[PDB]
Amino acid sequence: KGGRLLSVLLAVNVLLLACTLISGGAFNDTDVFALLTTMMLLAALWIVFYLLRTARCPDAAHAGPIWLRGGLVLFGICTLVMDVFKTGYYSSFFECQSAIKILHPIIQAVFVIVQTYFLWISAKDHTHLDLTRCGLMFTLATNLAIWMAAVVDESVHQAQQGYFYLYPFNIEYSLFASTMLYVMWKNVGGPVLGLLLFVVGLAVFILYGHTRQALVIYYSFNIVCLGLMTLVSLSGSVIYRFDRRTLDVALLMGAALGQYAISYYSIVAVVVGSPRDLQGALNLSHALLMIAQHTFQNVFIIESLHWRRRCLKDISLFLLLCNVILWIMPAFGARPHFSNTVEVDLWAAIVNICLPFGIFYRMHAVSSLLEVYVL
Amino acid sequence: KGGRLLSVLLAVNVLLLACTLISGGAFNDTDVFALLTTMMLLAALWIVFYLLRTARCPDAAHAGPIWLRGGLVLFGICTLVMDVFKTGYYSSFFECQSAIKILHPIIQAVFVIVQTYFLWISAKDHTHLDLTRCGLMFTLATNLAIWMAAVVDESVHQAQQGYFYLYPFNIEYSLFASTMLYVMWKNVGGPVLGLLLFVVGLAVFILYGHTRQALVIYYSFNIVCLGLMTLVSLSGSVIYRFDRRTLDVALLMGAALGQYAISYYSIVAVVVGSPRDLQGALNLSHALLMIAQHTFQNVFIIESLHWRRRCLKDISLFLLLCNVILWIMPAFGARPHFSNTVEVDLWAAIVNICLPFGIFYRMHAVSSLLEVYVL
């Protein structure tokens, strides 16, 4: 109402202007970086304004769980490293007069630091409601603009001193910061089975020209990973009948779209291509199990958030480490993986949009499972 | 909760499977039409099941305004004509054994008829909550799947007896049916200035190789069209200070994204191209006025839905016909219009996604303005 409604119009207009200019390169345009820098400083200038204006603010579950801030800080450090490498390679290829190109790393780092500190300190459950509402939503647009900026950049990344140390963790940072700003804007007025999966999950990462068996080892572990989660979550779904947070549900269901799309694109490619090798069947089973475990785990968490009881503790403990080993490969891995052969045929654009949502989903899942385990 | 939550997972899975298969042609795939037909019949089979199961239902502003059903029926008739032309040209080029190609028109027509009648009769503000919730959301997926099917089809339409009578009104039908199903799912448990614009708006449509003045006449009328709306809505915004529905706001703001994106893409193209002719300045002014009038009208409607008073009656009356003449050109016109020259350079894909939202926005606007005028 009023300023609250006006802020969204300001947010979408900044976003829509950015989104149009994000795809400037495909139109056959480096002016996007200048726009990206401009919104970063102004958002940062509001943050530093707020960091001293927060004294005026008569502040006051709702404060935001620890995992949010932890992931925020971690991915902020990752963005710091990313922009350090960026400015390093820019200074290595120092020739063009354009400065916005080298300013974007520095301004991005400054923005990351100030936003991280501000979100860390003020996430706890005021005054200047007109400016703050227009301030938080403007910062929301900046995170989404740089997110879609990075998505396009790595999508077209295919085809000297930076050693191509690309870190898509900035995308994960933008989503983590966006939800943290969202919640603040809303209040303006024997489980040892998972342990064995840690070693084998890391061993294949250490292990990974590839052999036919190497694909099987990677897929078989993944298949038995989701296959176990498909039935323990189903086991958790049937035991809840014995013992019978809007944004949490939206984030859980919403982030699941990332894994749904890649799996659905995988099964479509598998059936259309109709391969005869075991690789196609492995892909089909892996994607189907991914979708099934995602749906069942989502239902389990949604129902949960609304001796004997130790049974549900073990599976939640089991899925806790099982999810973590499922997050290592996306966070640290290769998007054009050898696992997908018929899908890459390049589909990296689909992977870039989708994988961070799965990474986002994993962090929400483990925190939710930990939340009900201690309860 | 429970079946209500399970339905959305069913809806998105059908949608996501469809969305992946919607873009099958670009992957270098007519199996999408078979999938489109399959979900249509099953959704239709639920409708005819519901049309006799509604007797069991103990039914009971919330019933849905008249404009929704009216647009639904109109665009359903348009879809009937479209599929009639489709099956006609298919029977004209009758050679391939594939039947799904010719079945899709007939099944689409049957689905349109049954869905139109069902939405017309049961939109009024039960039993079988498990099936109905999974039924409405399944129908929601079918409308969105065919919407994105049509969007891609006309996007790639560029480059004998059907005479290419393409009717994008099916897209408008899908959005109209989707919101009608959405609201049902939520409740499971001197203004003569506009008159002059009618003639000039139709005259240019009758008038429209083109001349330089022809572009000016088309743009000047559009500029003075929005320019008047930019200040009367502003006039309506300042008089509301003298005299000081969630889904309505979302639809109004959400449908505005269509006109925002094309205008924002226009201004980006205008400034980047930097043309010297009056055409570029006309485009820039037209798009800026579009964005400004959209924002101001949205704010005016949002505030409104929450002698002397005759002043706001006239402007709402003025915008009533002013919006209508602004809906004729998108509903009946050419997407690669001569107005955009630097933008087409082909950007028809952007136009196809965006214009129906403006058409949707216009219908919501006129109904809302009529709603407050009678009040």
UniProtKB/Swiss-Prot annotation, chains A, B:
Actives at neutral and alkaline extracellular pH, acid extracellular pH appears to inhibit the channel. Insensitive to activation by Zn(2+). The chain crosses the membrane at residues 5-25, 32-52, 65-85, 102-122, 136-156, 164-184, 190-207, 214-234, 252-272, 282-302, 314-334, 346-361. This is Proton channel OTOP2. GO terms for molecular function: proton channel activity. It is a multi-pass membrane protein. The keyword Transmembrane applies. GO terms for biological process: proton transmembrane transport. Belongs to the otopetrin family. InterPro entries: Otopetrin (IPR004878). Its main location: membrane. One of its GO terms (cellular component) is plasma membrane. Expressed at higher level in stomach, testis and olfactory bulb. Keywords: Cell membrane, Hydrogen ion transport, Ion channel, Ion transport, Membrane, Transmembrane, Transmembrane helix, Transport. Proton-selective ion channel open at neutral pH. Actives at neutral and alkaline extracellular pH, likely participates in some alkali-related physiological activities. It is found in: Cell membrane. It catalyses: H(+)(in) = H(+)(out).
